[PDB]
């Protein structure tokens, strides 16, 4: 049972801008997704300080980066707070309408795309490198869901019958054909070292057979 939703017009406009603007410094997508994972992990950590049962779904707080060259996917897994179905529908838990407004003003006032995270909409930087993004998530107060979009103005939400996650979020980037450098170990290591060196959770880069 799959539900299809239209993006709000402002978010569709954000996504078109990210997809269509010539901008070479695409590697910042990974900084932005790791930062989102860190923010999610901070939220479940804070809730656990007064209610340790919040971690019954998983005590470890970490980020895994999983490249798969056969499927052409880079997956960012975290064990943070996750998202409810309502959060997924409401722009993946962001204030994306107001964030887009400010970001588009800033781009016209000199800013560049790399600044997207200062506007709370860094998730959408995934579309610098992905033709399709799938988000699998599990929040303590809801069931496991899959969100997906290839842009084009719509996204889907369905219950996920895949491997249960416990708690957290998995962002699966189905990379564009010309963006496969982001599956190479040396390139991922370089980006994490350059942009994510002060993230306070372990970031494990998985290797491939
Ligand atoms: O920062 C930029 C930017 C674009 C062109 C020239 C200088 C900067 N952007 C990223 C891509 O989307 C638009 C905003």
UniProtKB/Swiss-Prot annotation:
* Annotated positions binding ATP: 36, 78, 97, 123
Location in the cell: Nucleus; Cytoplasm; Melanosome; Cell membrane
Superkingdom of source: Eukaryota
Which residue ranges does the record annotate as region Interaction with NR3C1? 1-209
Post-translational modification here is noted as: ISGylated.
- Annotated positions of the N6-acetyllysine modification: 43, 69
Note the effect listed for residue 32 to A. Answer: Strong ATP-binding. Strong interaction with HSF1, HIF1A, ERBB2, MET, KEAP1 and RHOBTB2. No effect on interaction with TSC1
Annotated effect of mutating residue 78 to A: Impaired ATP-binding. Strong interaction with HIF1A, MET, KEAP1 and RHOBTB2. Loss of interaction with HSF1 and ERBB2. Los of interaction with TSC1
The UniProt comment on domains reads:
The TPR repeat-binding motif mediates interaction with TPR repeat-containing proteins like the co-chaperone STUB1.
Protein's job: Molecular chaperone that promotes the maturation, structural maintenance and proper regulation of specific target proteins involved for instance in cell cycle control and signal transduction. Undergoes a functional cycle that is linked to its ATPase activity which is essential for its chaperone activity. This cycle probably induces conformational changes in the client proteins, thereby causing their activation. Interacts dynamically with various co-chaperones that modulate its substrate recognition, ATPase cycle and chaperone function. (Microbial infection) Seems to interfere with N.meningitidis NadA-mediated invasion of human cells. Decreasing HSP90 levels increases adhesion and entry of E.coli expressing NadA into human Chang cells; increasing its levels leads to decreased adhesion and invasion.
What's this protein's family per the entry? Answer: Belongs to the heat shock protein 90 family.
- State whether it acts alone or in a complex, and with which partners, per the record: Homodimer. Identified in NR3C1/GCR steroid receptor-chaperone complexes formed at least by NR3C1, HSP90AA1 and a variety of proteins containing TPR repeats such as FKBP4, FKBP5, PPID, PPP5C or STIP1. Forms a complex containing HSP90AA1, TSC1 and TSC2; TSC1 is required to recruit TCS2 to the complex. The closed form interacts (via the middle domain and TPR repeat-binding motif) with co-chaperone TSC1 (via C-terminus). Interacts with TOM34. Interacts with TERT; the interaction, together with PTGES3, is required for correct assembly and stabilization of the TERT holoenzyme complex. (Microbial infection) Interacts with herpes simplex virus 1 protein US11; this interaction inhibits TBK1-induced interferon production.
Q: What is this protein called?
A: Heat shock protein HSP 90-alpha
Q: Which organism is it from?
A: Homo sapiens (Human)
Q: Which residues of the full protein are shown?
A: 16 to 224 of 732
